[PDB]
Design a binder for this molecule. Structure first.
Ligand SMILES: Nc1ncnc2c1ncn2[C@@H]1O[C@H](COP(=O)(O)OP(=O)(O)O)[C@@H](O)[C@H]1O
Ligand SMILES: Nc1ncnc2c1ncn2[C@@H]1O[C@H](COP(=O)(O)OP(=O)(O)O)[C@@H](O)[C@H]1O
Ligand SMILES: Nc1ncnc2c1ncn2[C@@H]1O[C@H](COP(=O)(O)OP(=O)(O)O)[C@@H](O)[C@H]1O
Ligand SMILES: Nc1ncnc2c1ncn2[C@@H]1O[C@H](COP(=O)(O)OP(=O)(O)O)[C@@H](O)[C@H]1O
Ligand SMILES: Nc1ncnc2c1ncn2[C@@H]1O[C@H](COP(=O)(O)OP(=O)(O)O)[C@@H](O)[C@H]1O
Ligand SMILES: Nc1ncnc2c1ncn2[C@@H]1O[C@H](COP(=O)(O)OP(=O)(O)O)[C@@H](O)[C@H]1O
Ligand SMILES: [Cl-]
Ligand SMILES: [Cl-]
Ligand SMILES: [Cl-]
Ligand SMILES: [Cl-]
Ligand SMILES: [Cl-]
Ligand SMILES: [Cl-]
Ligand SMILES: [Cl-]
Lengths: 306, 306, 303, 304, 305, 306
C-alpha cells in the first residue's frame, strides 16, 4: 500500500444527462433520444482523475442517504476511489445536475447543491490529520466557502500546497481571501477574465493576467488555454506548453483531468515542468472521449502520448 | 384479469425547481428536486387504483434503478405490478422537468422502455383485455401497440377510452380514434384533431361533433377551469367544475380519466361517470402531483355531496 | 324516411350465346335483355319492393339510358326524386356476354356514378340523419361513401356496408371502420381478412377478423349455405331455405334489402337476418329484379 | 308514293370504348360508350332521308325498350317510321361492339326481329314497292324476303340497287343478284363474288364485267380511298375520290348508296348519280357515325 | 351478224301410219319423210327466210345425216359456216311416228347437240357481241345456253328464250333470270308458273308471274287464239290472222323468227309481235318447217290485207 | 541596487522631559528636550544601516525645516536618502513626546507627508522592490500603499517582513498578512490579531500556529524580556534573552527587525537570523535612542559570543 499524498475536498453530484434534437423552449415539451446517469461534480471528477492516473488519493465529499448517493459511492469505488471519508448525510438529497444537450452541442445545466451545501468550517476539523500530511490539496468552488477556507487554513498550518480550481468564479471578492491562501491556481480563459479583469486573448495578455494573479497570493499560475495549450507563469519564469494534437470529441471537464494529472506529478516530486505537461496530456486524452468515468485518462495512455 | 385495463407509458419524473430556467449555454443553480413516478399510463392506472377500481396495468420499465423506483412506487399506490415488463438493455423512460419560480416549466421526455412495445407483444394480454369492461389508452407508446390493444377490445365487445395526448400525428391516430368508443380530448387536443378551438360551449360542441364523425360515439371535452362537455349523437350536457382551491393543475385530466373509468366499471349512468371524473380532476388540482396525493373514493364522494 | 341508399345506377346490357366470342370474332347471340343494374339501384329496389320507406340517391346521365333507368325505378315502386341527372355524362352501363357453359365477360363504364364528390353529399345531410339504416356499396367514389358514413356516425345511425366490389382493399379499410354492419360474401371476406370461409369454422374466424376493423355486426353471406352472424357476443348459423335455383345473380342485393327492411322496422336482429335470408332465397328462384322479392313472398317462405 | 323504297335490317348499336378486351371471367372497365341507330337497312334509309330523298323505309323491331329507341332515333333523323313493323314477342336487333385501344373488336349480334321476315310478309307492301323509282336492299334480312321484294320491283319495272354486304352465302345470292338492276360491291365483296381482287382499275373492270354476266346492268365498285368505278356494257368510267380529311370510314358505303339513290330518284344523269354518292361517301368519312351527309354539304363538296 | 341463234340441229324421221305400234307389235306404215328439224335449226331457217341477217351455231355429226342437215339449211338461205362437224358422234335425230288420227310419238337422240360445253362458247364471243337479239331453246346442254346468255348479258344484248322443252323447271329458273324476252306457249306457261292460261285474264296472270322471274317482255303464244304481250307497262292481245289451217307444227318457231327479224330491224315492239303473229299464221297454212317457213313478201301481204 | 528595501513612516520626534505632565490650561517648565529622527520606517531603516545591511529606504518628508533635519540625521546614521520623497505643500511628520520624571509618556502625532502615500506612487519603486532580497513594512503609512509594496514583492518572488505595529484595525490588515511571508508581532499585537494572549510558550505557540493559517510561513513572536519564539510549519524554537542591563526598552522591536533583516540578507541560517535580531534587541535596550546609539555588528557579534 501507499500513503495518501493527495487530498481532494469538493462536491459530489449525480449527473442526469439527456441528448435531444432540440432544447425545449420555455413552456414546451420535447422528446430526447436518450439519457444517462453517472458520477459527477467537480470534486468527485477531479478525485477520480487523480485515481485513474495512479495517485494516492483521499477524497472527502458528501452524498445524501438516498438512491443517488448509493449510486455515487458505487461508482467511485468502481473507479478505484476509497469512499471511507465520503460523508453520508441522512435527511438531505444527494447533489445532482440536469444536463440537456442538443444536436449542435449547445446545452443547459441546472445544479442542486444537495448534500454538498451542508459542509461547515467545523466539519473540516475532523480531517485535519489527513490534510496535514497531504503533499498537495485540490479544491474547487462547488462547496461552501467557509469549508474550503478551513481546508486552506489547515494546509498553510501544515505547510502544504493548495491547488485551487477557481471554478465556478461566483462571488469574485469572496474568493479573494481563498486565493490568498492558495499556493497554485489554474484558471481558464473565463475565470482569469473575472478574477483579474484581463481577458487572455493571446499569450502576451495571458501572461499579464497571470502576473496579476501572482499579486493575490498564488506562487504558481497555470492558465488553462484549452485548444491553445497552457501557460505557466511564476515570478521567475513564463513557459508556453504546446497543446497535444488529438481528435477532439467531447471537451467537457478537460480542466478537471488537467488538475488531476498535475496533482499526480506534483505528489511524485516531479519537476514543475513535468507536472504541467502531465496535466496537459491528461486533458488532451480527456477530450478524445466522452465523460470522465471509465473514459478518464490513465497513466498508460498519458505517458504514451508524452 | 380485472374489470379495468390500462396500457401505456411508465416514466420517472426528475423535477427540478429553480429561480430561472437556463438559457442555452448557461449553468443555473436550482433550489431542489424530486424523483417520482410519472407517465400518462402509470398516472391513470394509479388514479384508478387510488379510487378503488379493480385495474390491471401493462407497461414497461428497464432493469435499472429508475425501473425499481417506478415499480415500488406503483405498489405503494395500490397498483399490482405483475404485468409490468422489465426489459433488459433498455433504460426506463424518464422526463427532465425544470420548474421556475414564476411557474413556467420545461419538459424533456425519453421514450425509454416505452418504445419497445410491438403489436406482437399485445397478444400475450388478450386474456386480460377480454375481461375488461373498459380499456384506457394514451399516446406515449408505439402506435401499433395501441392499435393492437384496440382491436382486441373491439373483437371482445369492450369499451375503449382514448386520451389523445400528445396529439402527435393526428392523421396517424385517425384509425385509433376509429376504434375508440370514448375519446376525451382537452382544449388543445380538440383544436389540433378537428381544427376547432373550443373557446366556448358553442364551439366546443362543434369540435365534439366533428369527433363523432371519426368513430367515437361518446366525446368528453375536458375544459379545465370550465368543467367538461359531454357530446354524443343524442345529447349535449355541460358539467360545471367544482369550486376548489387551485394549486397544481398538472395531470388533472389523468385523474379525470381514471375517475370516469372507475365509475364506468361500476355500471353507473354515463352522466354520473363524467361527474365522478369531474370531481376527481377537481381534487387533483388541490394538491401537488398524482403520486400518493391522488384523489380517493372517500374524497370524491365528499365533493359530490358538498 | 327510414332507409337511405346511396349507390350506383347502371343499365345492364345482357346477352346470351352458345360460346363467348374470341378477339376479332363475330358470334350470334341467342337473345338479350336490358334491365336496371348497379349495386345501389338493386338494393334500393329490393327495399322498395319489400315495403321499406326508402330514399335512393344515385346518379344517371341525361341520355336515353338515364330515362330507361329512371322509368324502370318508378315502376318498381321507387321514388326517383332524389336521383341526380347530370348533363354531359353517360349513365352507368355494363355489357355482360354469357357463354352456354356460364363463362361470362363484363365491361363496365362508370358513367355518372363517378361524378359524386364528398361535397355533393352535404345536400343530403337531413336525409342521412333521419335514416335508421344506410346502405352503401363500392360502386361510387370512395370520398362520397366516406362523406355519407361520417354523416351517419355524427347522427348515431347505422351503416350497412356491402364490400362489393372489393377493389382496393387498403383504400376501404377506413370505410369499414365507420361501418356498423358489414355483409361480405365468401370471395369478399376471403380478400379482406385473408381467410377463406370454406366452412363455418373458418367463416367464424374471418368474421372475428372483421370485428377488429370497426363493424360490430358481421353477416357473412355464404351463398347456397345460408348466412353466418358473427358478433362479439354470439355466433349463429342461418340455414338456407330449400328453393329451386334458377339465377343467383344479385341474391346478396336482395338479402341486404331484406335485412334493411326488417331492421328499419325494429325487428330483432335474428329476425332481420332471417328476413334477408328469405329475400335472397326468393331471388335465386327467379331471373333478375323485375320480380324482386316482396314482403308477401318472404313472409310465406318463413312460415 | 315515296319514289325511294328501302327494305332491310334495323339494329341498335351498343359500342363500348375500352382498353383491353375482357378475358373469360374477367370484369374490365370501359372509358365510355355511345348508343345509336344501326343496321345496314336503317343506315341507308337514314342516308337517303338526310339527303332530301322521298324515302319509305320498311324494317322490323321488337316491342321492347330498344325498339322504342330505334324508332325514336329514326324520327329524329327525318325518317318516317309509319311502315316499321313492331313485332311483339321478339327482341329488337342489337349488336355489342367492344373496341380496344389497339383496334381489336369483339362483336356479338342478335338478329332479333330482323330474322322474322318471310316471303309472305312482303305482299303487304306491294303497293309501295310498285311506286318506287328505286329500291335499296342489303344482306341483313332473310334471303326469302329479299327475293320477294325484288320480284315486286321487277314486276313493276322498277329498279333494285343491291348492296351485297355482308356477302354471306355467295352461292345463295346468285338468284338475288339476277333480279338486281344495280349492284354496288366494295373490294372485298367483288372479290368474293367474282373471284377477282380489284387491286387496280384494270382488275376492277374485270371484276365488274363478270358481275354484268349475272344480271345487273350497272355495276359500281366502291374502291374506298381511290373512289369508285362504274362498269356497264357500254362504258367504264373511274370517279376519282374527293380529297377530304379522313376520320372514321365505317359505313361510308351506306352514305354512298343513299346519295346515289337520291340522285337516281331525281332523274339525274348516271354519272352525276355516281358523283353524288362519291361526295356523300367522302363526307361520311370525315365524321364519326350516321347523321351522315346532307344535301347542302354534298353540293358544297362537289363544287368546291 | 345482227341475229344470233344457238341451238339444236336434228334430222327428223317422220313416219305416217294408220295405228302406232303397241309393245312387241310390228305394223305397216303408209309413208315417211326425212328433212331438217330441231328447235335451233327451225328458228334459224325462219329468220333466214324472212330476210334477217342471222348467224346460226349448231352441231352435226360427220355422217350422212350431217351432210343432209347442212345441205337443207343452205337450200333455205342459212349460212352454215358456224355449224360444227364433230367426228365420232351421230347427228342429232328424232323418230316421229304419227297416226292417221293425229296422235304421235317421238324419241329423240341428242347426238352432236349434246357435245356443247360452256368452254366451247368462248369461240363465239365476237358473234354474240354483235347480236341485237339471241334466240335460245332447251334442246342443248344447259351449261352452254347459260354461257351464251352470260355473253349476251355482259355485251348488252337481248336474249329471246323459247322455254321448250320445259324439262327440269328448277334448272331453267336461272336461265330465265338471264333472259330478256320469253315466249312460252300455253302448256309451257302452265308448268313454269303454275297458272293454266285458259283465257286472257288467266294468261295475263301467268305472264306477270314470269315478269317476276327476270324477263322484261313476256309473249304468251296462245296458238289458235293469237298471242299476248305482257310487260310491266302494258298488256296487249294480238288477235290471230284468219288463215286456212293445214299443219300447225313448229308454228311457234316461225313466230320467234318473225319477232326476232322485226326486232333486229328496230321496229316497234308491237310491230315485232304482229310480225311474228303473221309469220306463225303463214306456217300453219303449209306442211313442214323449212318449206312451210314464211317469207318477207308473204308476211307483209298478210299484214296489209 | 540594494539587498534590503524598507518602506515606512518618517517622523521628527520632539521629546521633552519634565517633572509633571501639564494639565489642561496649565503651563509647566521642562528640564530639557531633544529633537531626533523617529517613525517605525526610519527606525528600522537606520538599524539596518547601523548593522551593515545594504538598504534602500523609501519614505516621505515635507519640504520644510524638519524635512532637512530628518534627511540630515538619516545620512549621519549611514542611510542613503536618495529615494526619500520630498513633498511640497505638506509638513514633515512629527510626534510631540512629553515624558515625566516618573516615566509617563504623552504623544501627539501628525501624519504629515507619511499620509500622502498612494498605491499608485509605489509604481515608481518597482525596480528597487524587485531586486530586494527582503522588504520591511510597518503600519505607520497608508494601508493601500503597504499592500501595493507587498504585491510587488509577491510578483518578484521576494520576501516581505511585516511588523504588525500599530495593529489598529486587525481586520483591515488580514489581506496584508496574507501577502506577508514573515510576520514579527509582539505579545500585544499577537493577542489582537489572533485572540490568544501569549502569557507563556504554550499560548505563544498557539498564537503562532493561528498566524500561520493567515498566510505567513514564518512567525517570530517578540516576547520582550522573555526572548522571542520562532514558529513555523516545521519547527518551534524559543530563543532565550541575552542578559543585559535594561535602561530603555523603547523601539527594541525595530532593532530586532533590523537585525533579522541584515542576517537574512546575508543568507545566514534562519536560526542565526533570529538570534542576530535577538542580540540587536538586547543591545538596544541597554541604551537610550535608536539613532546614533543604534546597535552595530561589532556589538551584536560580541554579545552572541559572550
Ligand atoms: N483540444 C485540445 N487539445 C490539446 N489539449 C487540450 C485540448 N482541450 C483541452 N486541452 C488541455 O486541457 C487543459 C484544460 O482545458 P480547458 O478546456 O481550458 O479546461 P476547462 O475545463 O477549465 O475549460 C488545457 O490547458 C490543455 O492543455
Ligand atoms: N380549476 C379547476 N377547477 C375545477 N375543476 C377542474 C379545474 N381544472 C381541472 N378540473 C377538472 O379536471 C378535468 C381535467 O381538466 P384539464 O386540465 O382540461 O385536463 P388536462 O389536464 O388533460 O388538460 C376537467 O374536466 C375538470 O372537471
Ligand atoms: N341456393 C340458395 N338457397 C337458399 N338461400 C340462398 C341461396 N343462394 C343465396 N341464398 C341466400 O342469399 C344470400 C346471399 O348469397 P350470396 O350468393 O353470397 O350473395 P352474393 O350475390 O352477395 O354473393 C345468402 O346469405 C343466402 O341466405
Ligand atoms: N378517303 C376517301 N376519300 C374520298 N372518298 C371516299 C373515301 N373513302 C370512301 N370514299 C367514297 O365512299 C365510297 C364507299 O367507300 P367504301 O369504304 O369502299 O365503302 P364500304 O364502306 O361499303 O366498303 C367509295 O366508293 C368512295 O367514293
Ligand atoms: N290456227 C292458227 N291461226 C292463226 N294463227 C296461228 C294459229 N296457230 C298459231 N298461230 C300463230 O302462231 C303463234 C304460235 O302458235 P303456238 O301454237 O303457240 O306455237 P307453239 O305451240 O309451237 O309454241 C301464235 O302466237 C299465233 O300468232
Ligand atoms: N530585556 C531584554 N533582554 C534580552 N532581550 C530583549 C530584552 N528586551 C527586548 N529584547 C529583545 O528584543 C526583542 C523585541 O522586544 P519587544 O519588547 O517585543 O519589542 P517591541 O515590543 O517594541 O516589539 C525581543 O524578542 C528580545 O529578543
Ligand atoms: Cl460494492
Ligand atoms: Cl451528519
Ligand atoms: Cl320510274
Ligand atoms: Cl343543312
Ligand atoms: Cl354494232
Ligand atoms: Cl549634510
Ligand atoms: Cl508630490
Amino acid at each position: 500500500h501507499h500513503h495518501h499524498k493527495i487530498f481532494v475536498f469538493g462536491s459530489v453530484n449525480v449527473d442526469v444527462s439527456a441528448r435531444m434534437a432540440a432544447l425545449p423552449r420555455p413552456g414546451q415539451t420535447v422528446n430526447a433520444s436518450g439519457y444517462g446517469i453517472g458520477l459527477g461534480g467537480k470534486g468527485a471528477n477531479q478525485a477520480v482523475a487523480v485515481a485513474k492516473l495512479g495517485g494516492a488519493i483521499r477524497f472527502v465529499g458528501a452524498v445524501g442517504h438516498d438512491a443517488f448517493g448509493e449510486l455515487a459511492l458505487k461508482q467511485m469505488r468502481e473507479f478505484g476511489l476509497d469512499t471511507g471519508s465520503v460523508r453520508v448525510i441522512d435527511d438531505v438529497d444527494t447533489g445532482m445536475a440536469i444536463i440537456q444537450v442538443e444536436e449542435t452541442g449547445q446545452n443547459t445545466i441546472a445544479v442542486c447543491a444537495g448534500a454538498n451545501a451542508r459542509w461547515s468550517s467545523a466539519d473540516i476539523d475532523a480531517y485535519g490529520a489527513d490534510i496535514a500530511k497531504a503533499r498537495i490539496t485540490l479544491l474547487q468552488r462547488e462547496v461552501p466557502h467557509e469549508a474550503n477556507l478551513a481546508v486552506a487554513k489547515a494546509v498553510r498550518a501544515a505547510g502544504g500546497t493548495v491547488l485551487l480550481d477557481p471554478a465556478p468564479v461566483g462571488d469574485a471578492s469572496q474568493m479573494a481571501d481563498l486565493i490568498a491562501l492558495s499556493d497554485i491556481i489554474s484558471p481558464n480563459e473565463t475565470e482569469a477574465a473575472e478574477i483579474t479583469g484581463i481577458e487572455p486573448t493571446d499569450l502576451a495578455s495571458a501572461e499579464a493576467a497571470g502576473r496579476k494573479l501572482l499579486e493575490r497570493g498564488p506562487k504558481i499560475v497555470i492558465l488553462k488555454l484549452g485548444s491553445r495549450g497552457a501557460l505557466l507563469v511564476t515570478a521567475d519564469e513564463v513557459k508556453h506548453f504546446t497543446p497535444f494534437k488529438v481528435k477532439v470529441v467531447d471537451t467537457v471537464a478537460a480542466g478537471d483531468s488537467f488538475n488531476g494529472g498535475f496533482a499526480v506529478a506534483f505528489s511524485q516530486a516531479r519537476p514543475l515542468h513535468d507536472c504541467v505537461r502531465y496535466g496537459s496530456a491528461a486533458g488532451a486524452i480527456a477530450v478524445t472521449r466522452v465523460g470522465a468515468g471509465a473514459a478518464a485518462p490513465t497513466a498508460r495512455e498519458v505517458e504514451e502520448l508524452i
